């Protein structure tokens, strides 16, 4: 209701972002009348002139997102909010790193002896940048995920859940994790006893 120069309630913060991911910047702006906002890269380059960006603004929340980020997106990013009483600027740097790491089993496949009808969970925890591809095998054959053999991922934790184990399920289970910079394999034996 009373006039007041623009200000950033939440400013931009510099961030390091992994190659290929989506970088996002968000700010909260106040001011009356409602400030007009413009995004810039490297000082003088109007951001809406560069391809592959999404800029939105509503109710004093300004958001810039850059999907599929690459090293060419690194630079200094600025948000300018302006009305008749003044003009405010928030600036942050975006640095895009590769940061590659080959696949690593922080939790290895674990050998197990269970009884028939038991439910058995075969878990690994796998790190890696780019995120590795994780596949489960029994005796060298890839396991197709089904309701009885259910492969799932939660974070870096990958689980094969055998709904009810029978002797026919015994064998050497293995997990392969591969990304663009390395490979890793964990093997284990599963034995399920009969009658």
Author numbering: 1 to 195
Extract from the study:
We have developed a functionalized, modular biomaterial formed by the controlled self-assembly of two proteins. The ZT polymer is composed of proteins of human origin produced recombinantly in bacteria. It is based on the naturally occurring complexation of the protein telethonin (Tel) with the two N-terminal immunoglobulin (Ig) domains, Z1Z2, from titin in the Z-disc of the muscle sarcomere. Specifically, its 90 N-terminal amino-acid residues become “sandwiched” between two antiparallel Z1Z2 doublets, forming a wing-like hairpin structure that builds an intermolecular β-sheet across the three components. The display of peptidic sequences on the ZT polymer is established, with sequences having been introduced both in Tel and Z1212 components without preventing polymerization. Both components permit fusing peptidic sequences to their N- and C-termini and, in addition, Z1212 permits the introduction of motifs in four internal positions, namely the CD loop of each of its four Ig domains.
However, they possess a surface exposed loop, the CD loop, which is a region of low sequence conservation. We have demonstrated that the CD loop can tolerate drastic diversification in length and composition and have established its suitability as a locus for peptide grafting. In the Z1Z2 variant carrying the decorin motif KLER in the CD loop of Z1 (Z12KLER), the motif replaced five native residues so as to become inserted between residues V45 and L51. This insertion point was chosen as the V and L residues in Z1 corresponded to the natural flanking residues of KLER in decorin (VKLERL). Decorin is a protein associated with cartilage homeostasis that binds to collagens and plays a role in their stability, organization, and fibrillogenesis. In decorin, the KLER motif is located within a loop of the leucine-rich repeat 3, the region that binds collagen and the incorporation of this sequence in a PEG-peptide co-polymer promoted chondrogenesis of human mesenchymal stromal cells. It was envisioned that the CD loop would constitute a structurally suitable area to incorporate the KLER sequence. Interestingly, the overall pattern of exposed Lys, Glu, and Arg side chains with a buried Leu sidechain is preserved in Z12KLER, but the main chain adopts a slight helical turn that causes the side chains to be positioned closer together producing a compacter KLER motif than that of decorin. Given that loop sequences can undergo changes induced by their binding targets, it remains to be established whether the observed difference affects the biological function of the engineered motif. In conclusion, data on the various variants establish the suitability of the CD loop as a locus for peptide grafting, capable of supporting the display of bioactive peptidic motifs on the ZT polymer.
